[PDB]
Write a protein that binds this ligand. Structure first.
Ligand SMILES: CCCCCCCCCCCCCCCCCC(=O)OC[C@H](COP(=O)([O-])OCC(O)COP(=O)([O-])OC[C@@H](COC(=O)CCCCCCCCCCCCCCCCC)OC(=O)CCCCCCCCCCCCCCCCC)OC(=O)CCCCCCCCCCCCCCCCC
Ligand SMILES: CCCCCCCCCCCCCCCCCC(=O)OC[C@H](COP(=O)([O-])OCC[N+](C)(C)C)OC(=O)CCCCCCCCCCCCCCCCC
Ligand SMILES: CCCCCCCCCCCCCCCCCC(=O)OC[C@H](COP(=O)([O-])OCC[N+](C)(C)C)OC(=O)CCCCCCCCCCCCCCCCC
Ligand SMILES: CCCCCCCCCCCCCC(=O)SCCNC(=O)CCNC(=O)[C@@H](O)C(C)(C)COP(=O)(O)O
Ligand code: SF4
Ligand code: SF4
Ligand code: FES
Lengths: 178, 113, 119, 79, 97, 114, 208
């Protein structure tokens, strides 16, 4: 179906009362005054402004923030150099090099994420089979040099160690949906 | 009665839609008589024009004429008749009933490669 | 047809030498029969049963890597019976196969993975 | 038509063309077989004529103008 | 929500709408940020029998396009790509603004 | 060996269009240098134009010459109306690029590039 | 019935086949192929000489009424003699249908522009020329529309590199934005994501 937004159904004829109404409207600015009034109503409303940085905007456990590399409760790195995150990374922002470790475990010797290349899409954290790479809820990590946003494995492990008290909680909250 | 507005911007309302439609269809048929008899365009356009002209001659009411034509409003039908007449003139100039001008290479329309 | 016999793959006729297997006739036509144990430079084993195909007017599916075509055989390769046989054999392999794909060197080089996704 | 003036003013702009020397240039000199020029050099002299005279010259006439005789009588019977 | 009644009346008169009934700011009606754990259902293919993939393989039902006529392979009524479009009915809910 | 022409039936009319385009570029170059503040001189721009024409000057196919004329006219009118800016027109000269040496000894010292 | 498979209406296939026969017999001079996909879309492959007559017939015919050009695009398949495939998708509002008209070109055979038939073809053909190098005859203003000024080469071709040949950076010596030969700090790593097993037997090409 459809409807008209500007067509007038029939006409309201030409009345002297309607003429006087239009004359009052475009001589005494009635629509202007009512616009003024409702703008005044917004003046007398309460503003929607939060007090950053002392107040923070609401988020979700699904939020995709800063990348981190997680660990098992034993303490070993969850990553097993399986390279699906690099294969699925749509910006090619992940570089992984690997070799067998001194105990024979399959581990990464290089795990680099270019945050200036990354698009923050979570494809890595939804392709990770062991929940190693995650996108934790940190977003206030803006730097002053372009180099500092070129993360390596030590930076990502430090981020995972820093945010584990919250990343694991978010994964516990939201893992049943995924 | 007479239509107030046709609802489409830039389209004028036709006071006498029947006479305009019948002269447009007659002119289209007349320009279709110059085509070769074996022209499929001539055959199909003559069928379409003949059926539309019979509907205009049958129905003198604009509303039920529009409902019979099923081409939107009668102004739209008049404009479509104008476009069909200009098209038929161009098709007579172009002569596309002739055989295929050139076959393509053998892998031109092969997908996937 | 000098020392050659006529067979059919999906109704398409092809000349083959006597002694040609169903798999070899199929790849002569240009279709690759799924396999795990057949290798063209090894001896024929016939154990993995991935190459089971349906011959027309035959009730039991045959192993394409080992069975030689006789005469006039219509090898239905994409038939319902062949697809069911491939699905069953793939199910039996992946029943006891271990969930080791991320820690395995056959990342994109795995016949088991590729033939799983294909059949 | 001031034939002498247009003639020596043509030779004057050939003198100020940089690529050719002032030595072996003659009134009957040829651009490619004698002066060793190119086609784009030839149209450089033609457009030098055009913007030093103030009247437009077509490429059809420019292809014909190859030696100073046809240049000078072309501008003579064009003016 | 914390506005006085005088300010509420002034806002309502100045705007012409009941602003307190539809507040722009969310106070308590939103859902709790901590929710009970879900249990997502499974689809129709989550069955242990009568579920062969060849009976629901929609990706392999795609066929190459059928050639109506070709330059190498190849009294009736004039036709249309489709039956003509029916006119839209005017809305019985609110036909005009 | 029988093809469809674009604009020129043969190479003579193609050369005619080439001469017209060269004349128009030669007329434009002083106006370009005056209009957008170029560090180059008027003579150097015309030498650049002629070097471009000599780079393209090895072709014999009339369709290729016609398309080259069309591209030259597009770049020409793109210089007529001020769209191709000072940086865009200075990209023809490559002042900030070290020219690669052409001799085998320096190409050997520089790296593995043949 | 099957929740994972699209429902297919055969009436659209029949109607599009009938209209394909209709158009093919009205224009045998230009039409080289007519096909309807299993997705129920009509594709009509024509000679490049009949682009303007075919588009004009489809725009102005009473039974076609394809008054809206959905888009004009090109596909580079660099294994054919005429590597560019020009595709016109058209929408018929009166009959509520869609058609696709295909033609071919290469780097040295221009095709006629249809700006006189559709005015959107102006910018669409400008984009096609800028991306593929297909010249269009009688275009009122044919020039680049998306690439940088002075850009060399047509980037949507298959043989044009993804990162291109030059890159822009600010040079403080000349105080300019100069273009230099491209160098990548990290090279784009191409991936061989092709399974060596056949996926669709319905498209198995015969052996050569
Ligand atoms: C004339 C009106 C003057 C303003 C006034 O009285 O407003 C109150 C009140 C404002 O109503 P409201 O907008 O609903 O108040 C917001 C919340 O309901 C209630 O707001 P809240 O609960 O979030 O906190 C309110 C609190 C907030 O407390 C403060 O702001 C304290 C600041 C201390 C600074 C040291 O107290 C006040 O606002 C008391 C009034 C302060 C007026 C100060 C005027 C002078 C400013 C300095 C000049 C130099 O006025 C009225 O309701 C009617 C005003 C006209 C009466 C005649
Ligand atoms: C000094 C204290 C403050 C006063 C002002 C308070 C603030 C008001 C602010 C309102 C919002 C203004 C924002 C800017 C608006 C700009 C547009 C605008 O104003 O357009 C003007 C508009 C213009 O109207 P328009 O733009 O629609 O054009 C009309 C023409 N058409 C529609 C065909 C295009 O109105 C006027 O120009 C009228 C001005 C006021 C005239 C009042 C006349 C009253 C009667 C006169 C006396 C008659 C009796 C004589 C004695 C008889 C004795 C017996
Ligand atoms: C001056 C007004 C300032 C703002 C007052 C509060 C805004 C809200 C008012 C209520 C409202 O929205 O009413 C809607 C209504 C508009 O309703 P409407 O636009 O739906 O149409 C009214 C109905 N017909 C069509 C019949 C006309 O506003 C009015 O009726 C007011 C019209 C204007 C009155 C004043 C005109 C002259 C103004 C300037 C002269 C100086 C005045 C004194 C200034 C003193 C201080 C400097
Ligand atoms: C400020 C600076 C900006 C510089 C911009 C320069 C733009 C240059 C546009 C280039 C357009 C072309 O090159 S199209 C011309 C190419 N034409 C040909 O190759 C035709 C064949 N050429 C020849 O035969 C050549 O010998 C000649 C000398 C050109 C023709 O003369 P012949 O007679 O002996
Ligand atoms: S969020 Fe996306 S773009 Fe960023 S590293 Fe992960 S896969 Fe790559
Ligand atoms: S997907 Fe996970 S386990 Fe695999 S390489 Fe990436 S971070 Fe490591
Ligand atoms: S390939 Fe293993 S049984 Fe034939």
């Amino acid at each position: 179906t459809y409807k008209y937004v500007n067509k007038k159904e029939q006409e309201s004829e030409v009345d002297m009362k309607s003429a006087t109404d239009n004359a009052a409207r475009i001589l005494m600015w009635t629509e202007l005054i009512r616009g003024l009034g409702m703008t005044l109503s917004y003046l007398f409303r309460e503003p929607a402004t939060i007090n950053y940085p002392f107040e923070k905007g609401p988020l979700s456990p699904r939020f995709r923030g800063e990348h981190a590399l997680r660990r098992y409760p034993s303490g070993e790195e969850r990553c097993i150099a399986c390279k699906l995150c690099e294969a699925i990374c749509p910006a090619q922002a992940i570089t992984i090099e690997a070799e067998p470790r001194a105990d024979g475990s399959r581990r990464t010797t290089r795990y680099d994420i270019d945050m200036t290349k990354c698009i923050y899409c979570g494809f890595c954290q939804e392709a990770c089979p062991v929940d190693a790479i995650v996108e934790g809820p940190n977003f206030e990590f803006s730097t002053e040099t372009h180099e500092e946003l070129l993360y390596n494995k030590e930076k990502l492990l430090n981020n995972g160690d820093k945010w584990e008290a919250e990343i694991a909680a978010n994964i516990q909250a939201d893992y049943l949906y995924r | 009665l007479l239509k107030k507005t046709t609802g489409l911007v830039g389209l004028a309302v036709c006071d006498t839609p029947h006479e305009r439609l019948t002269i447009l269809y007659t002119k289209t048929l007349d320009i279709l008589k110059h085509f070769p008899k074996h022209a499929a365009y001539r055959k199909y356009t003559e069928q379409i024009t003949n059926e539309k002209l019979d509907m205009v001659k049958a129905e003198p009411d604009v509303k039920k004429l529009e409902a019979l034509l099923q081409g939107g409003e009668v102004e739209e039908v008049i404009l479509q008749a104008e476009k069909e007449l200009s098209l038929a003139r161009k098709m007579l100039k172009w002569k596309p009933w002739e055989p295929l001008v050139e076959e393509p290479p053998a892998n031109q329309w092969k997908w996937p490669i | 047809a000098s020392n050659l016999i006529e067979v059919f793959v999906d109704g398409q006729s092809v000349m083959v030498e006597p002694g040609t297997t169903v798999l070899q006739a199929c790849e002569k036509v240009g279709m690759q029969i799924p396999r795990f144990c057949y290798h063209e430079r090894l001896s024929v084993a016939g154990n993995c049963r991935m190459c089971l195909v349906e011959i027309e007017k035959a009730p039991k599916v045959v192993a394409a890597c080992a069975m030689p075509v006789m005469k006039g055989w219509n090898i239905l390769t994409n038939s319902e019976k062949s697809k069911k046989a491939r699905e069953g054999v793939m199910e039996f392999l992946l029943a006891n196969h271990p969930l080791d794909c991320p820690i395995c060197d056959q990342g994109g080089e795995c016949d088991l993975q590729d033939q799983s996704m294909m059949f | 038509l001031t034939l002498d003036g247009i003639k020596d003013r043509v030779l004057y702009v050939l003198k100020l063309y940089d690529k050719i020397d002032p030595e072996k240039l003659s009134v009957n000199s040829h651009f490619m077989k004698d002066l060793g020029l190119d086609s784009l050099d030839q149209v450089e002299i033609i457009m030098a004529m055009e913007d030093e005279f103030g009247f437009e010259i077509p490429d059809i006439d420019a292809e014909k103008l190859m030696c100073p005789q046809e240049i000078v009588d072309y501008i003579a019977d064009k003016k | 929500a914390s506005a006085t009644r005088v300010i509420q009346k002034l806002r309502n008169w100045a705007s012409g709408q009941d602003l307190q009934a539809k507040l722009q700011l969310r106070y308590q009606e939103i859902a709790k940020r901590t929710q009970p754990p879900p249990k997502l259902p499974v689809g129709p293919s989550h069955k242990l029998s009568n579920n062969y993939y060849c009976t629901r393989d929609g990706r392999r039902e795609v066929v190459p396009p059928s050639i109506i006529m070709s330059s190498q392979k190849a009294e009736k009524k004039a036709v249309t790509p489709a039956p003509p479009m029916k006119r839209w009915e005017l809305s019985k809910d609110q036909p005009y603004l | 060996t029988s093809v469809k022409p674009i604009f020129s039936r043969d190479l003579n009319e193609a050369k005619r269009r080439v001469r017209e385009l060269y004349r128009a570029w030669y007329r434009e170059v002083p106006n370009t240098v005056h209009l957008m503040q170029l560090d180059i001189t008027v003579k150097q721009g015309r030498d650049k134009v002629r070097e471009m024409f000599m780079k393209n000057a090895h072709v014999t196919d009339p369709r290729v010459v016609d398309l080259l004329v069309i591209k030259g006219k597009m770049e020409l009118q793109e210089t007529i109306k001020v769209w191709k800016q000072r940086t865009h027109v200075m990209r023809f000269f490559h002042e900030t690029e070290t020219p690669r040496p052409k001799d085998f000894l320096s190409k050997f010292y520089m790296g593995h590039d043949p | 019935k099957r929740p994972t498979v699209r429902p297919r209406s055969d009436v659209t296939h029949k109607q599009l086949s009938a209209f394909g026969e209709y158009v093919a017999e009205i224009l045998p001079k230009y039409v080289q192929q007519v096909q309807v996909s299993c997705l129920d879309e009509l594709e009509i492959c024509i000679h490049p000489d009949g682009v303007i007559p075919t588009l004009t017939f489809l725009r102005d015919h009473t039974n076609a009424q394809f008054k809206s050009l959905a888009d004009l695009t090109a596909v580079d398949v660099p294994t054919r003699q005429n590597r560019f495939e020009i595709v016109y998708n058209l929408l018929s509002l009166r009959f509520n249908s869609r058609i696709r008209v295909k033609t071919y070109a290469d780097e040295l055979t221009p095709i006629d522009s249809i700006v006189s038939v559709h005015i959107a073809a102006n910018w669409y053909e400008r984009e096609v020329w800028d991306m593929f190098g297909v010249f269009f005859f009688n275009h009122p203003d044919l020039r680049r529309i998306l690439t940088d000024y002075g850009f060399e080469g047509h980037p949507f071709r298959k043989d044009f590199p993804l990162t291109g040949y030059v890159e822009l950076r600010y040079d403080d010596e000349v105080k300019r934005v100069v273009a230099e030969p491209v160098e990548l700090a990290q090279e784009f790593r191409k991936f061989d994501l092709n399974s060596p097993w056949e996926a669709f037997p319905a498209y198995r090409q015969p052996p050569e």
